[PDB]
């Protein structure tokens with residue numbers, strides 16, 4: 163009765179087993195979104211920083227937390243726990259830059275035109291560029307300004323995160339056909355959650371599924387910026403986890 167409800171033009175809202183998952187998933191997001199005061203605490207980085215290595219510096223610091231937020235949200239999901247140590251790791255390395263991105267874009271203030279990193283620092287497109295990310299920063303900023311229209315909610319950001327995390331495409335995965343079922347499950351629940359929210363933007367699900375791809379790009383480019391970085395005459399200022407995540 164899914165494809166059917168489609169043809170009759172009804173938009174299926176979540177079901178019992180789904181509103182469950184949605185809760186289980188929404189909670190995580192919220193239990194790791196330290197949220198009510200970022201636009202408040204957000205420290206504007208001195209514009210003379212990143213006009214780079216200095217700005218890179220900052221970023222580098224306040225990043226270990228940012229990676230853990232992803233790490234902790236994954237810990238809460240029983241789907242992510244049913245999987246091996248190995249896939250678990252793979253999965254987190256794969257989705258990490260994707261999640262921090264969302265986290266970065268959802269915190270975009272169209273006003274001062276900056277993104278807020280780690281819920282503390284506020285930087286401009288130029289600062290994030292010259293800091294060591296180049297194009298990716300335009301990709302994250304541009305994403306942000308697009309999401310400032312999707313008006314996502316804790317659930318929507320959360321389930322997004324979830325779809326990012328359960329990627330059966332990551333190289334090395336062992337339990338492939340199972341992470342897919344888990345993904346497939348999240349996607350469905352997302353759509354349904356979407357219908358239930360009934361936004362007023364046509365193609366919301368298609369539009370939104372494109373951000374998933376976009377985030378995957380940023381993610382891919384970021385791996386390429388992470389190589390252009392390791393040079394610069396490497397070593398120092400590269401936090402251990404930041405290094406383990408992306409190798």
Ligand SMILES: O=C(O)Cc1cc(I)c(Oc2ccc(O)c(I)c2)c(I)c1
Nearest residue numbers: 221224225228262263265266279280294
């Ligand atoms: O904190 C969050 O939750 C999100 C977050 C944190 C930071 I610091 C950030 O900037 C990056 C990311 C990768 C990278 O290689 C470099 I240098 C800087 C992004 I974009 C997002």
